[PDB]
């Protein structure tokens, strides 16, 4: 049923991890849903670029041969894959300011913790790294060693938020 | 005939009841009209998120297994389901100001009264809760005990509005 | 061939006669062109609302049963169907200002004269009601009793406009 | 394959020759490409108007019977078909200012010369009418009687432009 | 499956090399992917122009007979194909300013070097022409004669960028 005719999601070259990962996941998901072969998918790839990136594709066209190589090359030229110590310094710089919702803080911190190499941290030390930066509006009620998984922190945060 | 190819309605994370309920009802209605199966509908769900929420879906992907569970989880993480006393204080705070149409006031107050638990109020006390906040431009003509249902209030409000 | 999948024309609740009549005529025309049945058309109606009006449709869903009833209810809740004397006062308030084209004035005045009940006025008194408000730039050349229909007024107005 | 479902090009009523001629040519071209019959094309015409013009179509609906009559009526009510002496005064009013490209000047002047009645001028006097208003940056090099057609003027203008 | 029905990419007449080359490559790629014949493709070409360029197409319609001739004519009337010495003066005018990423500089300089006639320069002198304008933030670490191809320059530039 077609092969990359037209869609809303495009890519520009904004140089950030979130936009690049969102675009790659959306394209990779669309290919699986619509059911397009691997050889037919690479011919339609300049139908998505609209910016500086199409000038980037006019030069590096002869380096790609398969779909996975082109996707890894798009991940390599733009996502700079920052090292570990900048991430560990970026988590401890900004505390949770007053009058901010729990869910935005938790999803931003989880998206920041996903950048580390996989298999290096469990769930328990993951929650222990995040339990040291919350406001005293939430730390007065729920103590440590009672919340065992990463869902129960939000489950008890939404109760104190409604109570005020 | 396809399975969530592309559409105008998307979701961002605006943290309000009206936008979330509108998006969920529009998606739930589109699934019923187009005739898509339940197993095929969950594979196409990241084609709708475009914001912070796609970073939220990159983390909580392994918690969803059926369509109803994913819809209830999207209702739970964003719509905060406010308690009763804040609603009963929110209805009595703002009176109807001068030079405002009847229909906007009635639809906003009905959308505010839908947040209570279902089966707790009849139609008569529902109209009795709304008849105490209207302007004297409308309360001089129509008295109580004459309007029995919730349609006749608008039916007699549109007559006095045309008369001026 | 589908049933209200996606289209550009939507409705918000702007509270005016022109936008409501345009939206209703465009939807009614699209249903006739595409060839959709009456029972299939009502299931897809919340795919068009995008505003306050979808909150209005979450409350008055159980009042509609057929397509004509829903269309008349959408005409009733928003188009206020103003009385006659306000129209007859609105026609005689604004004269035709200098340096304005004939066609805009004629189409606006015809759209204002359509609001009266049908069958109350002929063509001759219709032109007699409009011939008293034009500029002396046009009334110096063409006199009364020479223009018999409503087309010849524009036909002789476009000649004097080109001449200047 | 459908009959005027939805498209980007619409019409508003901007009262100019270029926009009206572009819209009419695009619609006339789309009808020929998609292959739609003449009786099916007139039912879908209010799906394109979005402005004051739809109020204009609610009044003059009963005057159209064929496609050519409706197209000529749309050309008549909006394009005012200016007389000859205003065109001959409009060509000689604005000279070519300094630092402006040749191609924009030539295409604008050709679009202005198309408004005259057809068959009144050859190619030679057409170029003779345009050779009297160019800058001395171009008239120092190429003389008259050497450029015979209307293409060689641009062909020798692009050479002097690159040279500077 | 259709023949140029509607798409996002259009052309206006912006008079620059990048936008024209992007539009031509996107159209040429879409024709190859969708599988349209050469005779059917030329009838649908005024469905893409939306600007001054459609007035340009109303005049030069009778000069095109095949697809390749129309594409070369669109490349000729707008892309001015600048001479060599302006390019060789444009490369050496702007050095790499401080706090700018390597990839943007490399892709812009490659897109500027593509304008020369093909077959005039190898890869080695191509890298030698670009190695004289970089910042001392990168020239302190990597010396000449160690980087042999044009990929290893970026491969060693991304390492020093992460290190800081």
Contacts of A108 (CB under 8 A, 6+ apart): B55
- Are the beta carbons of B33 and C47 separated by less than 8 Å? yes
Test the D interface: residue of C8, C11, C27 with most D CBs within 10 Å: C8
Q: Is D156 within 8 Å of D131 (Cβ atoms)?
A: no
- Say how many CA atoms lie within 13 Å of B75 toward its Cβ: 14
Positive or negative, the CA dihedral A6, A8, A13, A15 is: negative
Contact present, D58 and C112 (Cβ < 8 Å): no
Among C28, C107, C108, pick the best mutation site for testing chain D contact (most D Cβ within 10 A): C107
Helices and strands, counts by H and E, chain D: 9, 0
Residues B25 and C56: their CA atoms lie apart, in Å, by 13
Resolution for this PDB entry, in angstroms: 3.9
Longest dimension (CA), chain A: 61
Residues E87 and E110 sit within 8 Å (Cβ to Cβ)? no
Report the DSSP beta bridge partners of residue E49.
E11
* Dihedral sign from CA coordinates of D9, D11, D16, D21: positive
Residue E78 to residue E14: CA distance in whole angstroms: 9
DSSP letter, residue D117: P
Contact (CB, 8 A) for E145 and E126: no
Rounded Cα distance between D1 and E154, Å, is 50
CB contact under 8 A, C1 and D2: yes
Task: Please tell me whether residue C150 adopts helix, strand or coil conformation.
Answer: coil
Is E116 at the interface with chain A, CB within 8 A?
no
Q: Are D125 and D74 in contact (CB under 8 A)?
A: no
CB atoms inside a 10 Å sphere around CB E86: 11
Q: Which two tokens stand for residue D85?
A: 């002496």
**Alpha carbon distances (Å) from A150 to A115, A145, B65, B161:** 18, 12, 19, 56
Cβ–Cβ gap D21/E52 under 8 Å: no
User: With contact defined as beta carbons under 8 Å apart, do A101 and A138 qualify?
Assistant: no
User: Among E73, E55, E48, which Cα is nearest to E63's?
Assistant: E73
CA B39 to the chain's CA centroid: 28
Give the DSSP letter of residue D79: -
Cα dist. B17→B52, B89, D154, E84 in Å? 18, 17, 63, 62
Burial classification of residue E92, based on how many CB atoms lie within 10 Å of its CB (0-12 exposed, 13-18 middle, 19 or more buried): exposed
Neighbour-count burial of D157, counting CB atoms closer than 10 A to its CB (0-12 exposed, 13-18 middle, 19+ buried): buried
Distance CA C95, CA A130 (A): 71
E3 touches chain A (CB under 8 A): no
D92: three-class secondary structure by DSSP: coil
Closest Cα to residue A130, out of A153, A155, A157, A152? Answer: A153
**A57 within 8 A of A46, measured Cβ to Cβ:** yes
How many C-beta atoms lie closer than 10 Å to residue A22's C-beta?
21
- Determine the residue among A7, A30, A108 to mutate to test chain B binding: the one whose Cβ has the most chain B Cβ atoms within 10 Å: A30
**How far, CA to CA in Å, does C6 sit from each of A99, A133, C47, E2, E111?**
39, 46, 8, 19, 40
What are the Cα distances from residue E32, in Å, to A3, A27, A62, E26, E43? 12, 21, 18, 10, 17
**Tokens at residue E113, please?**
């070097």
Name the strand (E) or helix (H) holding C17: helix C17-34
Does A111 contact B47 at a Cβ distance shorter than 8 Å?
no
How far is residue C68's CA from residue C70's CA, in Å, rounded to a whole number? 5
Is the Cβ–Cβ distance between D71 and D26 less than 8 Å?
A: no
Q: Is A11 helix (H, G, I), strand (E, B) or coil?
A: strand
Q: What are A70's two structure tokens?
A: 């082109």
Contact C47 B32 (CB under 8 A): no
Measure Cα distances from E31 to A67, E34, E65 in Å.
Answer: 21, 6, 18
Q: Tell me the C-alpha distance between E106 and E28, whole Å.
A: 26
> Which DSSP letter does residue C3 get?
S
Token couple for B19: 């936008």
3-state secondary structure of A152: helix
CA diameter of chain E: 61
Task: Give the whole-angstrom CA distance, residue E52 versus residue E77.
Answer: 13
What is the Rg, in whole angstroms, of the alpha carbon atoms belonging to chain D?
21
Return the structure tokens found at E89: 């003066």
Contact by Cβ (8 Å): B160, B133: no
Question: CB contact, 8 Å: A85 with chain E?
Answer: no
Asked if E162 lies within 8 A of A80 by C-beta distance, the reply is yes
Q: Determine whether the interchain pair C58/B114 forms a contact, defined as Cβ–Cβ distance below 8 Å.
A: yes
CB atoms under 10 Å from CB of C12, counted, come to 13
Measured distance CA(E64)–CA(E58) in Å, rounded: 12
* Residue found by looking up tokens 């604005």 in the block: D94
Q: Work out the burial of residue C19: count CB atoms within 10 Å of its CB; fewer than 13 is exposed, 13-18 middle, 19 or more buried.
A: middle
User: In 10 A of CB E74, how many CB atoms?
Assistant: 22
**Measured distance between the N- and C-terminal CA atoms of chain D, rounded to whole angstroms:** 52
The answer to whether the CB of E21 falls within 8 A of the CB of A58 is yes
* Token duo for residue E130: 């670009």
The structure was resolved experimentally with cryo-EM
C10 neighbors B22 (Cβ within 8 angstroms): no
Q: What DSSP line would sit under A97-142, residue for residue? A: -SS--HHHHHHHHHHHHTTSPTTS--SHHHHHHHTTS--HHHHTTS
Cα–Cα distance measured from residue A18 to residue B70, given in angstroms and rounded to the nearest whole number: 23
Closest by CA to C100, choosing from C67, C138, C63, is C138
For residue D22, give Cα distances in angstroms to C22, D13, D19, D48. 24, 13, 5, 14
Q: Residue D126 is encoded by which pair of tokens?
A: 């057409």
> C82-89: long-range contacts (C-beta < 8 A, 24 or more apart)?
C82/B162, C82/C115, C83/B162, C84/C116, C84/C117, C87/C112, C87/C115, C87/C116
Which residue, A117, A159, A152, is CA-closest to A137? A159
Is residue A138 within 8 Å of residue A102, measured between CB atoms? yes
Give the closest residue to B61 by CA, choosing from A19, A107, A119, A125: A107
- If one counts every other C-beta atom within 10 angstroms of the C-beta of residue E16, the result is 12
Tokens linked to E100: 């700018």
3-class DSSP state of D57: helix
| Helices D152-163/D102-113 angle, 10° precision | 160
CB B12 within 8 A of CB B52: yes
Instruction: Count residue pairs from A and B with Cβ separation < 8 A.
Output: 51
Evaluate whether B73 touches B24 at the Cβ level (below 8 Å).
no
Residue D34: is it exposed, middle or buried by C-beta count within 10 angstroms (0-12/13-18/19+)?
middle
Q: How many other CB atoms are found less than 10 A from the CB of residue E125?
A: 10
- Rounded to whole angstroms, the Cα distance separating B54 from B59 reads 9
DSSP C49: B
Q: φ, ψ for residue A4 (rounded to 5)?
A: 55, 60
Closest CA to C72 of C28, C36, C119, C19: C28
Q: Which two tokens stand for residue B93?
A: 């705070």
Residues of chain E with Cβ-Cβ distance to A15 below 8 Å are 101
| B and A make contact (3+ CB pairs below 8 Å) | yes
Q: How many angstroms separate the CA atoms of B16 and B24, rounded?
A: 13
Question: Which residue is listed with tokens 């110590």?
Answer: A85
- How many residues in total does chain C contain? 164
Helix, coil or strand: residue C98: coil
Distance (Å, whole) CA B153 – CA B141: 12
Q: How many CB atoms lie within 10 A of CB A106?
A: 20
Cα separation, A151 vs B116, in Å, equals 27
Contact D5, C29 (CB under 8 A): no
Q: Which residues contact C164 (CB under 8 A, 6 or more apart)?
A: none
> Do E52 and D104 lie within an 8 Å CB cutoff?
yes
Which residues make beta-bridge pairs with E11? E49
Q: Distance between alpha carbon B76 and the CA centroid of its chain, in Å?
A: 15
Q: Which of D100, D82, D92 is nearest to D137 (CA)?
A: D100
Alpha helices for E35-122 (secondary structure H)? 38-41, 52-57, 67-78, 84-91, 102-113
Instruction: Please report the DSSP string for chain B in residue order.
Output: --SS---S--B-----HHHHHHHHHHHHHHHHHHT--HHHHSTTGGGTB-SHHHHHHTTSGGG--SHHHHHHHHHHHH-----HHHHHHHHTT----SS--HHHHHHHHHHHHTTSPTTS--SHHHHHHHTTS--HHHHTTS-TTS--SSHHHHHHHHHHHHH-
Task: Give the tokens for residue D113.
Answer: 């010369």
Q: Which burial class, exposed, middle or buried, applies to C149 when counting CB atoms under 10 A from its CB (0-12, 13-18, 19+)?
A: exposed
CA dist C64 and C62 (Å) reads 6
Contacts of D16 (CB under 8 A, 6+ apart): none
Q: How many CB atoms sit inside 10 A of residue B26's CB?
A: 20
Of the candidates E28, E14, E26, the one whose C-alpha atom is nearest the C-alpha of residue E79 is: E14
Instruction: Answer yes or no: are the C-beta atoms of A34 and A74 closer than 8 Å.
Output: no
* D108 within 8 A of D130, measured Cβ to Cβ: no
- b/e D61-87 (16+ beta carbons within 10 angstroms → b): eeebeebeebeeebeebbbbeeeeeee
Cα A2 to the center of its chain, rounded Å: 29
Q: How far is D110 from chain E, CA to nearest CA, in Å?
A: 7
Element (H, E) at C102: helix C102-113
Q: What distance in Å separates the CA atoms of residue D69 and residue C103, rounded to the nearest whole number?
A: 19
Q: Which of D8, D32, D107 sits opposite E55 (nearest CB)?
A: D107
What's the half-sphere exposure (Cβ side, CA atoms, 13 Å) at A5?
14
In angstroms, what CA-CA distances link D96 with D91, D99, D109, D134, D151? 11, 9, 11, 6, 19
Q: What tokens were used for B59?
A: 């983390």
From CA A134, how far away is CA A155, in angstroms rounded?
Answer: 15
Burial of D136 (0-12, 13-18, 19+ CB in 10 A): exposed
Q: What is the CA radius of gyration of chain E?
A: 21
What residue has token string 């001392």? E136
**Degrees (nearest 5) of the Cα angle C87, C89, C94?**
105
C21: tokens are 């009549």
C161–D80 CB contact, under 8 Å:
yes
d(CA D162, CA E161): 40
């Amino acid at each position: 049923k077609g092969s990359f005719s037209n869609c809303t999601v495009r890519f520009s070259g904004q140089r950030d991890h979130d936009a690049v990962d969102e675009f790659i996941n959306a394209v990779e998901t669309y290919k699986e849903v619509e059911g397009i072969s691997d050889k037919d998918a690479l011919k339609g790839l300049p139908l998505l670029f609209k910016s500086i990136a199409v000038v980037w594709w006019k030069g590096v066209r002869r380096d790609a041969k398969t779909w996975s190589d082109a996707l890894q090359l798009l991940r390599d030229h733009f996502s700079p894959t920052k090292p570990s110590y900048q991430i560990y310094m970026e988590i401890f710089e900004t505390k949770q300011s007053y009058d901010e919702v729990i869910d935005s803080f938790i999803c931003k911190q989880r998206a920041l913790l996903a950048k580390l190499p996989e298999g290096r941290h469990d769930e328990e030390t993951e929650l222990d790294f995040i339990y040291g930066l919350m406001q005293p509006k939430y730390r007065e009620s729920i103590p440590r060693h009672e919340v065992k998984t990463f869902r129960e922190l939000l489950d008890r945060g939404r109760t104190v938020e409604r109570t005020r």
